Design an enzyme around this catalytic site. Structure first.
Site, PDB file in Angstrom:
ATOM      1  N   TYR A 165      29.554 -30.056 -66.336  1.00 41.46           N
ATOM      2  CA  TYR A 165      30.543 -30.818 -67.076  1.00 41.46           C
ATOM      3  C   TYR A 165      31.881 -30.848 -66.342  1.00 41.46           C
ATOM      4  O   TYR A 165      32.483 -31.913 -66.185  1.00 41.46           O
ATOM      5  CB  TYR A 165      30.719 -30.250 -68.479  1.00 41.46           C
ATOM      6  CG  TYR A 165      29.636 -30.625 -69.470  1.00 41.46           C
ATOM      7  CD1 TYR A 165      28.443 -31.247 -69.056  1.00 41.46           C
ATOM      8  CD2 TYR A 165      29.786 -30.317 -70.822  1.00 41.46           C
ATOM      9  CE1 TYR A 165      27.453 -31.572 -69.962  1.00 41.46           C
ATOM     10  CE2 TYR A 165      28.793 -30.630 -71.744  1.00 41.46           C
ATOM     11  CZ  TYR A 165      27.631 -31.259 -71.308  1.00 41.46           C
ATOM     12  OH  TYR A 165      26.665 -31.570 -72.231  1.00 41.46           O
TER      13      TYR A 165
ATOM     14  N   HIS B 172      20.846 -28.986 -64.637  1.00 39.66           N
ATOM     15  CA  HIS B 172      19.753 -29.955 -64.652  1.00 39.66           C
ATOM     16  C   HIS B 172      18.865 -29.803 -63.440  1.00 39.66           C
ATOM     17  O   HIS B 172      18.821 -30.651 -62.542  1.00 39.66           O
ATOM     18  CB  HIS B 172      20.275 -31.375 -64.838  1.00 39.66           C
ATOM     19  CG  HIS B 172      20.807 -31.623 -66.213  1.00 39.66           C
ATOM     20  ND1 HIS B 172      22.156 -31.656 -66.498  1.00 39.66           N
ATOM     21  CD2 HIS B 172      20.170 -31.797 -67.394  1.00 39.66           C
ATOM     22  CE1 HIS B 172      22.329 -31.861 -67.790  1.00 39.66           C
ATOM     23  NE2 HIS B 172      21.139 -31.951 -68.358  1.00 39.66           N
ATOM     24  N   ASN B 173      18.144 -28.695 -63.436  1.00 41.05           N
ATOM     25  CA  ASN B 173      17.314 -28.342 -62.305  1.00 41.05           C
ATOM     26  C   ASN B 173      15.913 -27.970 -62.750  1.00 41.05           C
ATOM     27  O   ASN B 173      15.576 -28.029 -63.934  1.00 41.05           O
ATOM     28  CB  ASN B 173      17.945 -27.178 -61.541  1.00 41.05           C
ATOM     29  CG  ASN B 173      18.210 -25.991 -62.433  1.00 41.05           C
ATOM     30  OD1 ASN B 173      17.325 -25.565 -63.190  1.00 41.05           O
ATOM     31  ND2 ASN B 173      19.434 -25.463 -62.377  1.00 41.05           N
ATOM     32  N   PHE B 174      15.114 -27.540 -61.791  1.00 37.87           N
ATOM     33  CA  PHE B 174      13.747 -27.196 -62.077  1.00 37.87           C
ATOM     34  C   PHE B 174      13.571 -26.032 -63.079  1.00 37.87           C
ATOM     35  O   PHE B 174      12.651 -26.064 -63.907  1.00 37.87           O
ATOM     36  CB  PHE B 174      12.973 -26.945 -60.793  1.00 37.87           C
ATOM     37  CG  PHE B 174      11.537 -26.664 -61.030  1.00 37.87           C
ATOM     38  CD1 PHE B 174      10.679 -27.682 -61.435  1.00 37.87           C
ATOM     39  CD2 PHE B 174      11.039 -25.373 -60.898  1.00 37.87           C
ATOM     40  CE1 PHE B 174       9.343 -27.428 -61.670  1.00 37.87           C
ATOM     41  CE2 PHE B 174       9.700 -25.110 -61.142  1.00 37.87           C
ATOM     42  CZ  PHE B 174       8.856 -26.137 -61.530  1.00 37.87           C
ATOM     43  N   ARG B 175      14.438 -25.024 -63.013  1.00 37.14           N
ATOM     44  CA  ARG B 175      14.345 -23.923 -63.965  1.00 37.14           C
ATOM     45  C   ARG B 175      14.538 -24.403 -65.411  1.00 37.14           C
ATOM     46  O   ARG B 175      13.923 -23.880 -66.335  1.00 37.14           O
ATOM     47  CB  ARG B 175      15.327 -22.796 -63.630  1.00 37.14           C
ATOM     48  CG  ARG B 175      15.034 -21.489 -64.384  1.00 37.14           C
ATOM     49  CD  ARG B 175      16.047 -20.399 -64.064  1.00 37.14           C
ATOM     50  NE  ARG B 175      16.137 -20.205 -62.620  1.00 37.14           N
ATOM     51  CZ  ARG B 175      15.370 -19.376 -61.921  1.00 37.14           C
ATOM     52  NH1 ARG B 175      14.461 -18.611 -62.527  1.00 37.14           N
ATOM     53  NH2 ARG B 175      15.531 -19.312 -60.612  1.00 37.14           N
ATOM     54  N   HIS B 176      15.388 -25.406 -65.593  1.00 37.51           N
ATOM     55  CA  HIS B 176      15.550 -26.015 -66.899  1.00 37.51           C
ATOM     56  C   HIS B 176      14.272 -26.699 -67.392  1.00 37.51           C
ATOM     57  O   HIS B 176      13.872 -26.534 -68.535  1.00 37.51           O
ATOM     58  CB  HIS B 176      16.698 -27.010 -66.904  1.00 37.51           C
ATOM     59  CG  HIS B 176      16.811 -27.770 -68.187  1.00 37.51           C
ATOM     60  ND1 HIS B 176      17.162 -27.167 -69.378  1.00 37.51           N
ATOM     61  CD2 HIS B 176      16.589 -29.072 -68.473  1.00 37.51           C
ATOM     62  CE1 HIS B 176      17.172 -28.071 -70.340  1.00 37.51           C
ATOM     63  NE2 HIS B 176      16.818 -29.232 -69.820  1.00 37.51           N
TER      64      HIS B 176
ATOM     65  N   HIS C 198      10.930 -34.592 -67.933  1.00 40.45           N
ATOM     66  CA  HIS C 198      12.009 -35.242 -68.664  1.00 40.45           C
ATOM     67  C   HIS C 198      13.375 -35.340 -67.988  1.00 40.45           C
ATOM     68  O   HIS C 198      14.150 -36.206 -68.354  1.00 40.45           O
ATOM     69  CB  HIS C 198      12.159 -34.636 -70.048  1.00 40.45           C
ATOM     70  CG  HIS C 198      13.119 -33.498 -70.100  1.00 40.45           C
ATOM     71  ND1 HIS C 198      12.865 -32.289 -69.493  1.00 40.45           N
ATOM     72  CD2 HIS C 198      14.332 -33.383 -70.683  1.00 40.45           C
ATOM     73  CE1 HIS C 198      13.887 -31.475 -69.695  1.00 40.45           C
ATOM     74  NE2 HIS C 198      14.791 -32.114 -70.416  1.00 40.45           N
TER      75      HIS C 198
ATOM     76  N   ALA D 165      32.978 -24.461 -77.889  1.00 39.19           N
ATOM     77  CA  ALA D 165      31.909 -25.401 -77.591  1.00 39.19           C
ATOM     78  C   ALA D 165      30.594 -25.005 -78.274  1.00 39.19           C
ATOM     79  O   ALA D 165      29.965 -25.831 -78.938  1.00 39.19           O
ATOM     80  CB  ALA D 165      31.717 -25.509 -76.100  1.00 39.19           C
TER      81      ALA D 165
ATOM     82  N   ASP E 192      14.429 -29.286 -75.584  1.00 43.86           N
ATOM     83  CA  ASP E 192      15.429 -29.695 -74.616  1.00 43.86           C
ATOM     84  C   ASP E 192      16.686 -28.835 -74.691  1.00 43.86           C
ATOM     85  O   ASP E 192      17.238 -28.450 -73.658  1.00 43.86           O
ATOM     86  CB  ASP E 192      15.788 -31.154 -74.862  1.00 43.86           C
ATOM     87  CG  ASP E 192      16.503 -31.788 -73.694  1.00 43.86           C
ATOM     88  OD1 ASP E 192      16.347 -31.272 -72.565  1.00 43.86           O
ATOM     89  OD2 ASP E 192      17.205 -32.805 -73.907  1.00 43.86           O
TER      90      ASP E 192
HETATM   91  C1  LIG Z   1      28.588 -28.299 -74.076  1.00 43.01           C
HETATM   92  C2  LIG Z   1      27.511 -27.490 -74.774  1.00 43.01           C
HETATM   93  C3  LIG Z   1      28.190 -26.435 -75.631  1.00 43.01           C
HETATM   94  C4  LIG Z   1      26.570 -28.359 -75.614  1.00 43.01           C
HETATM   95  N1  LIG Z   1      25.190 -28.290 -75.102  1.00 43.01           N
HETATM   96  C5  LIG Z   1      24.532 -29.433 -74.811  1.00 43.01           C
HETATM   97  O1  LIG Z   1      25.106 -30.538 -74.982  1.00 43.01           O
HETATM   98  N2  LIG Z   1      23.201 -29.397 -74.310  1.00 43.01           N
HETATM   99  C6  LIG Z   1      22.513 -30.658 -73.995  1.00 43.01           C
HETATM  100  C7  LIG Z   1      22.578 -28.201 -74.130  1.00 43.01           C
HETATM  101  O2  LIG Z   1      21.299 -28.073 -73.660  1.00 43.01           O
HETATM  102  C8  LIG Z   1      23.257 -27.029 -74.433  1.00 43.01           C
HETATM  103  N3  LIG Z   1      22.932 -25.714 -74.362  1.00 43.01           N
HETATM  104  C9  LIG Z   1      24.001 -24.995 -74.795  1.00 43.01           C
HETATM  105  N4  LIG Z   1      24.995 -25.856 -75.136  1.00 43.01           N
HETATM  106  C10 LIG Z   1      24.550 -27.115 -74.913  1.00 43.01           C
HETATM  107 MG   LIG Z   2      18.171 -35.120 -69.585  1.00 42.85          MG
HETATM  108 ZN   LIG Z   3      17.207 -31.863 -70.341  1.00 40.28          ZN
END
Ligand SMILES: CC(C)Cn1c(=O)n(C)c(=O)c2nc[nH]c21
Ligand SMILES: [Mg+2]
Ligand SMILES: [Zn+2]
Ligand SMILES: CC(C)Cn1c(=O)n(C)c(=O)c2nc[nH]c21
Ligand SMILES: [Cl-]
Ligand SMILES: [Mg+2]
Ligand SMILES: [Zn+2]
EC number: 3.1.4.35
Lengths: 326, 326
Positions: B244, B72-76, B112, B272, B222
């Site tokens: 996480y 959750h940084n600027f590159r994002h 955002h 995941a 997003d």
């Molecule tokens: C934990 C992950 C696999 C799920 N997941 C997520 O929740 N967000 C919000 C993402 O932008 C994202 N990008 C890849 N996986 C993501």
């Molecule tokens: Mg957000």
């Molecule tokens: Zn975001």
């Protein structure tokens, strides 16, 4: 807390519009931001669909093609274009001129000394240089300046004119050429005369009248240093003389005619400036003041002051050198 | 030859329009120049009289207010805003949306995740943090992102909306709030349903219908990093999992509840992704394809390829754990 140098604070944006702006405070990239801003602020980016990125590249390429001369350098280039920018505001030129005309005035100002070798036309012609041979002794420097300008613009990355229909380009190119070629001091008297002649019954819709006015405008900015406040104006004179002496030393050293006005042995700051202000600068601005009254208060005022300052300095110079013999 | 890094090549300017764009190659200042380019290229500066410099200062302040999180940084935010810009071309959105709509979409994309702590809403609520207390457990992060967004614009030198009339401001402000708040994944299924309901008979001039489409668009951008080529996509997954894991570690260490999907012990990268791609990403994009058919071939396809790739990795990951675990 605060922002990088290349983002102009609102104080700077304000001062940029005025001839009192201190050109010595800034570094290459700062100056490039200012020039960039001028193009946006005059609405040239808008009306000519200039890609704002192309513009930055162009400006940077232009900077690369100025040389490390004492006077004829990027700082001078900047100084000229800044003066031009002030006059557009001071004289409300956007009322009298089309946007095309403003585009021409600004671009030519930025371009007018591109790749200046640091030696005047007379040097080129007398030493039979590449440039003199190439241009058949006809304003070799100005032709070359103008040629380099269009070489830069012929490059896709730098082509700020890419969104202009061919018939617009042709009109712009023709305008730039006229303006840049008019900066050759040899033509001064001629241009002044034509201007003065048309100045008797001037018509803002006669194209040849306008052309001469644009010519006079760029000529004004070209040599507008002495119009700036003393602290700013004064170092420029030293730089100019530095360049002149460099030339005469070479000319002496290679057995070529030396111009008295460039001779280290014959020239003093004051004597150089006095006649120049009195007989070249003042009359030129006097004539412009007839079209734009505000110019008197802003341009003529400080020129008169400079005249007096240098006249007084001559008295001092004379009295001191008198002392050293009798 | 040598242009500074922050002057973007014509090739770069070009690739910026595609979702294959490699977001990893760029330093902050370049990412800034790219975002700047977008505002000009879309006609936002033109149509809203944005002071070109204020834009730059604004962008810089936004940069300053992003944190150094793994994800959750600027590159994002750059990544999200770049995807949004692609959507505008790919889906020809300017035939469907006002310039006001686009401005909302771009600006909200950029703003955002402002000032994101690196711990999600569930963490704030359960740990009874200052943000959770301030916002009464209602989308506290997203509410905070917004407030910062408008605290930034409340600064006159950063205010890219200075020359927008108050009605326009109110309208933009309202749009931005709605969109940023729609980025809270807790609301995902709620929003999907609303959109799907509207989708049965979609009306391009119904405001409720458009508000929801815009919500879906920001939501798509997003989590869109998963749509880019593997080389670009995968590192993002490692970054997110880092965040996480940092959180679930803290939650274990403080006696707070831990979500299975954030658990160091329960989660594999491959499993995941498969889950996320299959039950979140594909269904979302599938329903968007019904309005924009070109989305299938450029988002949905890469998504199918991804889903297959991770299914392979899973088989290999499982085998590895069949060798450990004793
Ligand atoms: C934990 C992950 C696999 C799920 N997941 C997520 O929740 N967000 C919000 C993402 O932008 C994202 N990008 C890849 N996986 C993501
Ligand atoms: Mg957000
Ligand atoms: Zn975001
Ligand atoms: C005397 C004149 C021909 C030479 N000359 C000149 O060309 N410029 C541009 C000056 O600023 C200047 N100042 C003194 N002489 C000057
Ligand atoms: Cl007088
Ligand atoms: Mg010259
Ligand atoms: Zn010059």
């Amino acid at each position: 807390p605060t922002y990088p140098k290349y983002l102009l604070s609102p104080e700077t944006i304000e001062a940029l519009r005025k001839p009192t702006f201190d050109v010595w405070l800034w570094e290459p990239n700062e100056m490039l931001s200012c020039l960039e801003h001028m193009y946006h602020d005059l609405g040239l980016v808008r009306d000519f669909s200039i890609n704002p990125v192309t513009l930055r590249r162009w400006l940077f390429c232009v900077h690369d093609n100025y040389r490390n001369n004492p006077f004829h350098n990027f700082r001078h280039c900047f100084c000229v274009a800044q003066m031009m920018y002030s006059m557009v505001w001071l004289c409300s030129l956007q009322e009298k001129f089309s946007q095309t005309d403003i585009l021409i005035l600004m671009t030519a100002a930025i371009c007018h000394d591109l790749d200046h070798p640091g030696y005047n036309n007379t040097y080129q012609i007398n030493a039979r240089t590449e440039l003199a041979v190439r241009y058949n002794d006809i304003s070799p420097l100005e032709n070359h300046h103008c040629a380099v300008a269009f070489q830069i613009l012929a490059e896709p990355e730098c082509n700020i004119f890419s969104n202009i229909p061919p018939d617009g380009f042709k009109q712009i190119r023709q305008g730039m050429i006229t303006l840049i070629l008019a900066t050759d001091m040899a033509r001064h008297a001629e241009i002044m005369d034509s201007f003065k002649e048309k100045m008797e019954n001037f018509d803002y819709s006669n194209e040849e009248h306008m052309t001469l006015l644009k010519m006079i405008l760029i000529k004004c900015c070209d040599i507008s240093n002495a119009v700036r406040p003393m602290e700013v104006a004064e170092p420029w004179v030293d730089c100019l003389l530095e360049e002149y002496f460099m030339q005469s030393d070479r000319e002496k050293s290679e057995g070529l005619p030396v111009a008295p006005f460039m001779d280290r042995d014959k020239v003093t700051k004051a004597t150089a400036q006095i006649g120049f202000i009195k007989f070249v600068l003042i009359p030129m601005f006097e004539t412009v003041t007839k079209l734009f009254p505000m110019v008197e208060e802003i341009m003529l005022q400080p020129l008169w002051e400079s005249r007096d300052r240098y006249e007084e300095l001559k008295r001092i110079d004379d009295a001191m050198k008198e002392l050293q013999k009798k």
